[PDB]
């Protein structure tokens, strides 16, 4: 055994030992319990970043832990390959997105292999290959014929300078984020998944997920946004009907979740597109201007609640069906056409948004709920104003004194008897628009024929292959400019026809890839029945919190769609969910000519602990704040530089020790060095142990007869095994597991292990320590284990707790006063807490 730890000389050998043993290449072996551990697969963007290394090290720790516990562990990796990154790189570099993508995959794959992740590379998928995306085209066609996928006109943000469609997030003050041109609202036909048909199942099935973080489930519930409310119809006042047709001339229908407060409504509000808004605005320029502003907004959903709420009065009035009040109709920017009826009532005394709106416009606030003897102040919102549980109705006529549920039913009764309303369930959830006007994505398998309509491509003709010999130029979506792609014959009649040229939302590929891993070469279906039956669901899913709403909702939805098609047997794709925190780093810059900043990458900087300077010249830089690693402030630390300087195990150890997985992980030069020094210490501890006599049989069995010092070390050892097992298995807090092994090594360092029994215990300590750390730093532990013991580390298995090492050897002593037993220097103090002391047997209190 070499004296000094050298990662470069042991990490490739360990990797070849694992590869040759095919330990990570798993099959559907019915004789070993399965465990499916999945880290969210990466976009092949070019090179790994620290977020990747953190994520996949966490996944590898859990996978290797389960492997040592005897599970048949599938840990697959693949590439989420479609999307805008490659399209832009193409525009920037004059290369095909496919060529850029495949070169990135090859490079990043080598990087992942160099980190020693126990990955089943025979299950690799790349979502941009027709062998993958043919199956989501297949599902699309099946659902399209059932109406679960449908085609409908929708409104998009069109950027006329860049000639591209923009998400709301890419619109800044009504202008495209890159072009700076005013965007145009355009109506275009698009394809939608009818995910609202599954809203109730997606909501209720969250309750099954006892091993999901409660905040992820709360976010999904709020996103789905089910409410149980009341449709209420306010008759349009006789003076307010000009310009109105049909039922819009008769009543204004609203939806409310608080019909118990209907007696306290003081105005109503409609969307900009509502017919009452249109009729009121016909002669009123301020209203026309307000409506135009509302229609031109592009506020992202994440920002909707934060936008300033504004409205304009219409001079039109409706009548409250309960109390007969005439209420003015307002147009408001927070009422969205297409949600419910596009009209709401307002109760400013008991809804905080209505309170602030009414406070702004000096609209009335009417208390109709009381909570105890709490004083109501119309001028200041109090939390109890919105309480639904502990209030009773006041100022509500014959409804006074009722609680929420009784008042709800009473109002429903009154409204239904009048014909003025009825209970109604609503969902915030929108259907999922999947059309993208982009080239680098899965083609939509539709052919447009003027005789037959929008025709799904037959299953025998799938895939619709995306041509890879394309370099986007930026002047519009390439597929629409390629008649060699879109000109075709109709599969139903043989006539002239055109292929759909929009591609699929790339969330589609990540909504089912976890099933494709189960049989990635299966050519007769999305996933083979035998594989789906064996692997079932993902046991452990690991990924970033930014995917907690959309990706997870879509994956759950696709799972239920595939279940209903008879392809899988589970209702939910992911049993346990671990969401990792971001990686952050200090920022540095040097000053600018126009009073700005230009940002320096950390690896090009050297500190002095006073100031910092640039490595190339040694001139001063300015240390700035710490924030998430990104190209924006050039504070990404390249993991390849970390691996080149210290090796894979140091990178993995630092990532796992620096913070618990959910916490933000702060890049630290000294922390990286400390991780490396600990691996050197581990190496030296084993080297020095073996140099004093070589390996012996590890201590096992009855420890009666061991010295106290060695009993104490065995107690620490099995205490540490218990802690580490609970940290890996239950708490998923790997930093504390590492610290526990460090404390064990500290106690070992202070214990004399030179005797025959001491060497047996030292062997037991070191054999446990290297297996406890193997999930985290497998290369060095594999190597050290081989010097300690001739068995296959993965066949020795996870260390077992010896409960006998955890019980302490007590001796029962009799106590007596004046020679008569009255119960049963250290022993003197206990018998007084109960003086001749016959050592260990008798203590006598000279009364």
Ligand X SMILES: CCCCCCCCc1cn(CCC[C@@H]2CO[C@H](COS(=O)(=O)NC(=O)[C@@H](N)CC(C)C)[C@@H](O)[C@H]2O)nn1
Choosing from 15, 24, 55, 57, the residue that interacts with ligand X (CB under 6 A) is 55
Binding to ligand X by residue 549, rule CB under 6 A?
no
Task: Tell me which of Zn ion, ligand X, none is bound by residue 351, counting a contact when its beta carbon lies within the kind-specific cut-off of 5 to 8 angstroms.
Answer: none
CA distance 28 to 518: 9
According to the binding rule CB under 6 A, does residue 778 interact with ligand X? Answer: no
7, 386, 543, 758: which one binds ligand X (CB under 6 A) = 543
Q: By CB under 5 A, tell whether 451 contacts Zn ion.
A: yes
Q: Which residue has the tokens 């990747």?
A: 52
Binding segment for Zn ion among 398-406, 445-453, 568-576, 666-674 (CB under 5 A)? 445-453
Distance, in Å, from the CA atom of 47 to the CA atom of 111, rounded to the nearest integer, reads 8
Residues 671-690 close enough to bind ligand X by CB under 6 A: none
Q: Indicate the residue among 257 and 630 with the shorter CB distance to ligand X.
A: 630
Residue 452 sits in the site that holds Zn ion (CB under 5 A):
yes
Tell me which of ligand X, Zn ion, none is bound by residue 66, counting a contact when its beta carbon lies within the kind-specific cut-off of 5 to 8 angstroms. none
C-beta closer to Zn ion: residue 181 or 492:
492
Tell me the window of 98-106, 115-123, 563-571, 622-630 that interacts with ligand X (CB under 6 A): 622-630
Nearer residue to ligand X within complex by CB, 445 or 636? 636
Q: Is 510 near ligand X (CB under 6 A)?
A: yes
Q: How far is the CB of 502 from Zn ion (least distance, A)?
A: 20
Asked if 43 interacts with ligand X (CB under 6 A), we say yes
Binding of Zn ion by 570 (CB under 5 A): no
451 binds, among ligand X, Zn ion, none (CB under 5 to 8 A by kind): Zn ion
Q: Is 42 a residue that touches ligand X (CB under 6 A)?
A: yes
Beta bridge partners of 614: 605
Quick check: 36 and 537 in contact, CB under 8 A? yes
Decide whether 125 or 490 has the Cβ nearer to Zn ion: 490
Task: Among 40, 329, 562, 651, indicate the residue that binds ligand X (CB under 6 A).
Answer: 40
Closest distance of CB 562 from ligand X, Å: 17
Contact 590, 598 (CB under 8 A): yes
Residue 630 engages ligand X in binding (rule: CB under 6 A): yes
Distance between CA atoms of residues 843 and 819, nearest Å: 10
What are residue 449's DSSP bridge partners?
A: 453
For the CA atoms of 261, 263, 265, 266, the dihedral, rounded to the nearest 10 degrees, stands at -150
Show the CA angle centred on residue 741, arms to residues 735 and 745, nearest 5°: 140
Q: Is 544 in the site for ligand X (CB under 6 A)?
A: yes
Length in residues, the chain: 847
Of the candidate residues 10, 490, 568, 768, the single one contacting Zn ion (CB under 5 A): 490
Kindly list the distances between the CA atom of residue 611 and the CA atoms of 211, 605, 622, 673, 755, in Å, as whole numbers in the listed order. Answer: 47, 11, 8, 20, 52
Pairing of strands 311-319, 326-332: antiparallel
Give yes or no for residue 551 binding ligand X (CB under 6 A). Answer: yes
| 505 binds ligand X, rule: CB under 6 A | no
Q: Which of 492, 545, 690, 722 binds Zn ion (CB under 5 A)?
A: 492
Decide if residue 80 touches ligand X (CB under 6 A): yes
What sign results for the dihedral spanned by CA atoms 358, 363, 368, 371?
Answer: positive
Contacting ligand X (CB under 6 A), which of 629, 653, 793, 827? 629
Regarding 583 and contact with ligand X (CB under 6 A), the answer is yes
Helix (DSSP H) and strand (DSSP E) numbers for the chain: 26, 35
Number of residues that bind ligand X (CB under 6 A): 24
- Residue 132 makes contact with ligand X by CB under 6 A: no
Closer residue to ligand X, CB minimum distance, 48 or 312? 48
Q: Which of 397, 399, 369 is nearest to 382 (CA)?
A: 369
Whole-angstrom Cα distance, residue 59 to residue 65? Answer: 10
Position 631 contacts ligand X (CB under 6 A) = yes
**Smallest distance, Å, CB 448 to Zn ion?**
9
Binding to Zn ion by residue 211, rule CB under 5 A? no
Q: DSSP letter for 429, please.
A: P
| Rounded least distance, CB 628 to ligand X, Å | 6
Comparison of 496 and 622: residue with beta carbon closer to Zn ion: 496
Closer residue to ligand X, CB minimum distance, 309 or 551? 551
Of 101, 112, 54, nearest in space to 629 by CA: 54
Contact between residue 790 and residue 782 where contact means Cβ atoms under 8 Å apart: no
Residue 669: in which H helix or E strand, if any? Answer: helix 669-691
Residue nearest to ligand X (CB): 544
Q: Does residue 538 sit in helix, strand or coil? A: strand
Q: Is 567 in the site for Zn ion (CB under 5 A)?
A: no
Binding at 547: pick from Zn ion, ligand X, none (beta carbon under 5-8 Å per type):
ligand X
Nearer to ligand X, 127 or 157 (CB): 127
In the bound state with Zn ion, the residue whose beta carbon lies nearer, of 453 and 754, is: 453
Binding of Zn ion at residue 605 (CB under 5 A)? no
* Closest among 420, 422, 366, 419 to 397, alpha carbons compared: 366
Stretch touching ligand X by CB under 6 A, among 24-32, 44-52, 252-260, 474-482: 44-52
User: CB 452 → Zn ion: shortest distance, Å?
Assistant: 3
Collapse the DSSP code of 243 into the 3-class scheme (helix H, G, I; strand E, B; otherwise coil) and give the result: coil
Residue 66: enclosing H or E segment and its boundaries? helix 50-68
52 binds ligand X (CB under 6 A): yes
Which segments within 553-704 are labelled E, that is strand?
574-580, 583-591, 597-600, 605-607, 612-614, 620-628, 665-666
Any contact of residue 633 with ligand X (CB under 6 A)?
A: no
If contact means CB under 5 to 8 A according to the sort of partner, which of Zn ion, ligand X, none does residue 678 touch?
Answer: none
Q: Counting beta carbons within 10 angstroms of the beta carbon of residue 582, is it exposed (0 to 12), middle (13 to 18) or buried (19 or more)?
A: middle
Helix (H) or strand (E) holding 642: helix 639-646
635 or 703: CB nearest ligand X? 635
If one asks whether residue 76 binds ligand X (CB under 6 A), the answer comes out as: no
Binding of ligand X by 51 (CB under 6 A): yes
CA distance 320 to 323: 6
Burial track 34-63 (b if 16+ CB lie within 10 A, e otherwise): bbbbbbbbbbbbeebbbbbbbbbbbbbbbb
Q: Taking CB within 5 to 8 Å according to partner kind, which of Zn ion, ligand X, none is near residue 630?
A: ligand X
Alpha-carbon separation of residue 3 from 683, 684, 687, 754, 779 (angstroms): 8, 7, 6, 20, 16
Among Zn ion, ligand X, none, residue 452 binds (CB under 5-8 Å by kind): Zn ion
Any contact of residue 50 with ligand X (CB under 6 A)? Answer: yes
Q: Residues 493 to 522: which contact Zn ion by CB under 5 A? A: 493, 495
- CB-based contact 444:500 (threshold 8 Å): yes
**Contact footprint for ligand X (CB under 6 A):** 40-43, 47, 49-52, 55, 80, 510, 543-544, 546-547, 551, 582-583, 628-631, 636
**Contact footprint for Zn ion (CB under 5 A):** 449, 451-452, 490, 492-493, 495
């Amino acid at each position: 055994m070499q004296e000094h730890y050298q990662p470069a000389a042991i990490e490739p050998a360990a990797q070849k030992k694992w590869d040759d043993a095919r330990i990570s290449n798993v099959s559907e072996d019915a004789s070993k319990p399965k465990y499916y551990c999945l880290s969210m697969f990466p976009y092949p963007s070019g090179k790994l970043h620290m977020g990747h290394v953190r994520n996949y090290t966490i996944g590898d720790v859990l996978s290797r832990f389960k492997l040592l516990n005897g599970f048949n562990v599938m840990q697959p990796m693949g590439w989420d390959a479609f999307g805008m990154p490659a399209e832009n790189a193409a525009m920037k570099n004059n290369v095909a997105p496919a060529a850029w993508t495949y070169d990135n995959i090859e490079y990043m794959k080598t990087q992942l292999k160099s980190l020693g992740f126990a990955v089943d590379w025979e299950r690799e998928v790349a979502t941009c290959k027709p062998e993958y995306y043919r199956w989501e085209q297949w599902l699309f066609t099946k659902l399209f014929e059932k109406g679960i996928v449908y085609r409908k006109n929708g409104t998009v943000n069109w950027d006329p300078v860049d000639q591209t469609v923009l998400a709301n997030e890419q619109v800044i003050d009504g202008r495209g984020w890159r072009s700076g041109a005013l965007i145009e609202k355009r109506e275009i036909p698009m394809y939608y998944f009818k995910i609202t048909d599954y809203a109730e199942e997606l909501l209720n099935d969250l309750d099954k997920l006892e091993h999901w973080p409660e905040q992820v489930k709360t976010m999904q519930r709020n996103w789905i946004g089910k409410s149980r409310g009341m449709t209420v119809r306010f008759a349009v006042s006789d003076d307010s009907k000009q310009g109105l047709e049909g039922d819009y001339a008769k009543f204004l229908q609203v939806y409310t979740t608080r019909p118990d407060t209907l007696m306290g409504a003081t105005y109503v509000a409609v969307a900009a597109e509502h017919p009452l808004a249109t009729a009121a605005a016909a002669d009123k320029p301020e209203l026309q201007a307000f409506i135009a502003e509302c229609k031109a907004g592009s506020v992202a959903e994440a920002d909707m609640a934060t936008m300033e709420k504004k409205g304009v009065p219409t001079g039109r009035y409706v009548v409250n069906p309960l109390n007969g009040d005439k209420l003015e109709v307002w147009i408001a920017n927070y009422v969205l056409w297409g949600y419910g009826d596009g009209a709401v009532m307002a109760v400013p005394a008991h809804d905080e948004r209505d309170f602030e709106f009414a406070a702004k416009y000096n609209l009335p606030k009417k208390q109709v709920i009381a909570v105890g003897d709490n004083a109501f102040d119309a001028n200041r919102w109090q939390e109890w104003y919105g309480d639904k549980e502990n209030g009773v109705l006041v100022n509500s006529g014959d409804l006074d004194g009722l609680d929420f549920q009784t008042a709800f039913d009473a109002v429903a009764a009154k409204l239904q008897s009048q014909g003025a309303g009825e209970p109604k369930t609503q969902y915030r959830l929108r259907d999922w628009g999947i059309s993208r006007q982009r080239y680098w994505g899965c083609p939509i398998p539709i052919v447009h024929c003027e005789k037959c309509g929008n025709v799904p491509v037959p299953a025998d003709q799938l895939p619709v292959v995306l041509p890879e010999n394309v370099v986007p130029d930026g002047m519009g979506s390439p597929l629409a400019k390629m008649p060699e792609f879109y000109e075709t014959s109709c599969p139903c009649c043989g006539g002239a026809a055109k292929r759909e040229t929009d591609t699929m939302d790339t969330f589609i590929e990540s909504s089912w890839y976890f099933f494709r891993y189960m049989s990635p070469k299966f050519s007769d279906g999305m996933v083979s029945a035998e594989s789906a039956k064996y692997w079932g669901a993902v046991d452990q899913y690991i990924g970033g919190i930014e995917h907690a709403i959309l990706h997870l909702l879509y994956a759950r939805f696709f799972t239920k769609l595939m279940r209903d098609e008879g392809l899988v047997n589970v209702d939910e794709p992911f049993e346990r969910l671990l969401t990792q925190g971001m990686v952050v780093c200090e920022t540095y810059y040097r000053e600018n000519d126009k009073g700005g900043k230009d940002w320096i990458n950390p690896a090009d900087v050297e500190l002095t602990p006073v100031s910092a300077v640039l490595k190339a010249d040694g001139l001063p830089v300015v240390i700035s704040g710490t924030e998430k690693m990104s190209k924006s402030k050039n504070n990404g630390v390249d993991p390849q530089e970390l691996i080149n300087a210290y090796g894979a195990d140091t990178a993995r150890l630092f990532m796992m020790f620096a913070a618990p997985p959910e916490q933000s992980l702060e890049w630290s030069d000294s922390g990286v060095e400390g991780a490396h020094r600990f691996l050197r210490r581990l190496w030296r501890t084993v080297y020095e142990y073996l140099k004093q006599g070589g390996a012996v049989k590890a201590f096992a069995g009855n420890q009666d007869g061991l010295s106290k010092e060695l009993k104490d070390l065995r107690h620490k050892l099995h205490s540490t095994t218990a802690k580490v097992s609970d940290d890996y298995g239950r708490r998923q807090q790997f930093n504390t597991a590492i610290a526990a092994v460090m404390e064990l090594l500290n106690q070992y360092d202070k214990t004399d292990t030179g005797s025959e029994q001491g060497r047996a215990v030292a062997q037991e300590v070191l054999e446990a320590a290297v297996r406890l750390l193997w999930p985290i730093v497998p290369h060095i532990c594999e190597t050290l284990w081989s010097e300690l013991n001739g068995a296959k580390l993965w066949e020795a298995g996870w260390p077992t707790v010896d409960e006998a090492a955890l019980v302490k050897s007590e001796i029962e002593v009799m106590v007596q006063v004046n020679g008569k037993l009255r119960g049963k220097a250290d022993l003197e103090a206990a018998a007084l807490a109960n003086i001749i002391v016959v050592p260990g047997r008798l203590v006598n209190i000279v009364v």
